[PDB]
Amino acid sequence: ALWEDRDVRFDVSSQQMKTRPGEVLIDCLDSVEDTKGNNGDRGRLLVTNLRIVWHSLALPRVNLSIGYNCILNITTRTANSKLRGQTEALYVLTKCNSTRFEFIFTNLVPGSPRLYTSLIAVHRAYETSKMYRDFKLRSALIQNKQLRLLPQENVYNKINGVWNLSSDQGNLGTFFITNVRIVWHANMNDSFNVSIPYLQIRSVKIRALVIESSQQSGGYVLGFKIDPVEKLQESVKEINSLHKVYSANPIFGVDYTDAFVAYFADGNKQQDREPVFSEELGLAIEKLKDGFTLQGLWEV
């Protein structure tokens, strides 16, 4: 469903670069040349709400899309002294489904390098806010007896005595309904709580309050049971209404081809062999490559 902040795509279409409903553009910069691919071609860089995009600005087909849940390090490099003005450069390190890429972005015209700052800022806002768009078990949600609300979140329905049909004897627990996510704590050792976001929900039906996950948190079917079913169907219908009105415009809580092969961070390596034990060092070491030895790789 949502891939803009979860993958890293190359030669993306002119439509997938367009702002998703919940997405929103923040800052832009022209003439940002792309490097780590020596095409020597200019472009335009965009720091959106969920991902960073770069399109060639002359052949807008060739482009890059990097999600914020797939970046590890972002480094700004101020160099290239007096000969001209102090120009910056952006080094982004990315790891998607166990494959490490690195992209470099060179600001050609030294007259507008401010972009490289705001990105950093929003990236923090992307990581400090994951309870908005991700699924978590047993977190630190509950205060003394109440829920700790996110910034853009207020409770809708406050129901006591809502069971959980995934355990045996620690069930009876409160059920908080909010505009961003729905949570249930256990009211007895209140660290068995589940916080499901509307973004991860696929369909709320009955078989009993069955909630299915959207192929990202796996097929996690959650079952709850309440007092006589009047309030039950009431809660189900209001939950479906809130789900649809959210999916209309997502929130995301962010406050404020061979293309891949030319962007590997390792260098001609998209792999990680099976980590096996090492009797030489005593550490878990990556498997050695068909004849190589540790004391032969170490020396020069």
Binding site: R84, G85, V109, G111
Partner: protein, 50 residues
């Protein structure tokens, strides 16, 4: 005590034009020369025959 070699003087401005390649500004220099009067270095005095 000695009189200057010439009364003329120069005045030079060095400025910069901000541009697209070097926004710090290409440096240029332009000058103008003024002419000072004898009334600054001389006075009417007595003449001698030889």
């Amino acid at each position: 005590s000695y009189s200057p070699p010439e009364l003329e003087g120069n005045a030079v401005v060095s400025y910069s034009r901000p541009t697209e390649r070097n926004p710090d500004g290409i440096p240029r220099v332009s000058q103008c020369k003024f002419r000072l009067p004898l009334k600054l270095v001389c006075l009417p005095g007595q003449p001698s025959k030889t």
